[PDB]
Amino acid sequence: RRRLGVMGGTFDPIHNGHLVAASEVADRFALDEVIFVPTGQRKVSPAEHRYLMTVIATASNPRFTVSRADIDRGGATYTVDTLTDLRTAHPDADLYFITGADALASILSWENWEQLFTLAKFIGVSRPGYELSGLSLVEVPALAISSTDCRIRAGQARPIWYLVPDGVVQYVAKHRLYS
Amino acid sequence: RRRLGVMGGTFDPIHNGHLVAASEVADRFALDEVIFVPTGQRKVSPAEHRYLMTVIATASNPRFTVSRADIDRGGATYTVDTLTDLRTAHPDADLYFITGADALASILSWENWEQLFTLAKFIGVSRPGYELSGLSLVEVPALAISSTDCRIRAGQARPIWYLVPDGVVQYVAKHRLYS
């Protein structure tokens, strides 16, 4: 069966932390594809901008794609809705939902994760400054990067080079996203 | 006076840790340029390959250039020789020698650093897993990346995406540098 990575995120902006994590997981579980899924709509940049920055970010990687499913569904994004639609859209694939330590704790604490485990294999990945502890835990390269830090840098005219892809650096400057 | 960053390195390969560090320093001290200087000739990849990967890596950044001075001098690279030649090649500029915590300790422990401080301002930067303590100490984004780890990944056919620039990922694959 086809092995599809899934990685949800606000992606405001997508950064090298998100991308290095997806790439490690893709290697360790021999995934054919990773679909990045921008969440639907602290100011959150419009959905279309977050979507496009994600297409630009993932463009160069032969295995990474983007779904606009969550942004098009409308309203709030729940993990169950994301995976169910992906199950319907890729009936013959095995889904691997990729999630960093903070968002994993949140799913385990606040969602019916037993149901979620019936829709996909869960791959919890490490993130600097958080505690990682049917579900698999993987250590990915330690890149202490948050979108928050990027948004603060962009607003203070401080550089986000080498924290996000060159495409995202350009895209943030051109559309003036966080100033 | 013109403010020139200088960053020496083996650059085998250059990675996002090196580049994010140079970029932070460039912002904090309003540098006009950062010159990356590959050291002259554990197998170290030929000088020309390390040089080119550095040109490719720094290409997209308007403020980053490369000097082939150290690789062309011949023999072993000493910090004093690097800075003296840069002083001669850019007589009217102020040099800022950029160096991570491990290489800083090594210079302070093993070289006549008082002389070196007469040729340039020293900017010690943080690196994960090392202790940072005329000289300035700056915290740069924490990206736990080493060329060593990249070389080991490349040799085991494991991905170095988002640890090095896309150009370096391509360049390592094409010339098969560490396999």
Ligand SMILES: Nc1ncnc2c1ncn2[C@@H]1O[C@H](COP(=O)(O)OP(=O)(O)OP(=O)(O)O)[C@@H](O)[C@H]1O
């Ligand atoms: N540096 C990182 N390394 C690994 N996983 C990360 C990293 N940053 C975020 N993640 C994971 O990426 C997913 C989406 O994160 P999210 O969109 O909130 O990004 P973010 O960097 O945390 O932005 P923000 O700081 O605005 O919350 C989550 O599963 C989260 O755990």
Ligand SMILES: Nc1ncnc2c1ncn2[C@@H]1O[C@H](COP(=O)(O)OP(=O)(O)OP(=O)(O)O)[C@@H](O)[C@H]1O
């Ligand atoms: N992740 C990093 N963040 C900040 N500085 C770094 C980082 N990696 C290396 N440096 C600095 O880059 C300069 C050159 O390092 P070098 O060429 O030895 O790279 P490296 O990553 O340590 O490779 P190797 O692992 O083969 O020693 C030094 O001043 C070093 O302290």
Ligand SMILES: [Mg+2]
């Ligand atoms: Mg977050």
Ligand SMILES: [Mg+2]
């Ligand atoms: Mg080193």
